Copies of this chain bind each other. A is one copy, B any other.
Amino acid sequence: MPFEFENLGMGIILIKPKVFPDKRGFFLEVFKSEDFTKMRIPNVIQTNMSFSRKGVVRGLHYQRTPKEQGKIIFVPKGRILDVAVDVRKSSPTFGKYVKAELNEENHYMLWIPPGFAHGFQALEDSIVIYFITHNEYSPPHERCISYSYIDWPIKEVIISDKDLQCPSLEKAEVFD
């Protein structure tokens, strides 16, 4: 119990850390190798960070085999609606998705195993940390499916040219 783990379906796991507040502010252990390994989450190999203004959409990204990635998503500032989409063709759940609000109030995390496309909308101005497992950044293996697959709550969507040209699910080059 430094963490509580909840199965959200399809290999997606919500992680709940313990937060210790005092006069100074607060403290938490975000990730610990031993606890996460017991839950079948492997070593972190890369850590990224983004700052996203309210309404920003980033996604839905994945790296194809043999450069597939797992992801632990953490929101130390702001609020995001985080999404993972099963993009493994032969999965009994291909095209199905998990949604979860990760924010600075809860300090919850989502573990997203390989075979999913990840995206989020910033509900507020948000800092997102990505703990990346399996394989590093590899542009030749990068793929995406359109954000439009998802019904996002904020109307004033801010989105990159790259993300706008992402193919729909049924057109995309996806996992097995």
Q: Which residues of A contact B (CB under 8 A)?
A: 22-34, 43-53, 56, 58, 76-77, 107, 125, 127, 129, 131, 136-137, 158-160
CB of A27 within 8 A of CB of B46, answer no
Q: 19 new A-B pairs (CB below 8 Å) besides A28-B48, A32-B46, A47-B131?
A: A23-B158, A24-B56, A24-B58, A24-B158, A26-B50, A27-B51, A29-B48, A29-B137, A30-B49, A30-B129, A31-B46, A32-B45, A32-B136, A43-B43, A76-B76, A76-B77, A76-B129, A77-B127, A129-B129
Q: Whole-angstrom distance between the alpha carbons of A49 and B77 in the complex?
A: 12
In the complex with contacts A76-B77, A77-B127, A129-B129, A46-B29 CB distance below 8 A: yes
CB of A53 within 8 A of CB of B25, answer yes
In the complex with contacts A23-B158, A25-B52, A44-B44, A32-B137 CB distance below 8 A: yes
Determine the residue in chain B with the shortest Cβ distance to A34. Answer: B136
Contacts of A22 in B (CB 8 A): 160
10 closest A-B pairs by beta carbon, nearest first, are A25-B51, A33-B45, A30-B47, A25-B52, A31-B47, A24-B56, A27-B50, A26-B51, A32-B46, A25-B53
Question: A50 is contacted by which of B25, B44, B48 (Cβ under 8 Å)?
Answer: B25
Contacts of A28 in B (CB 8 A): 48-50
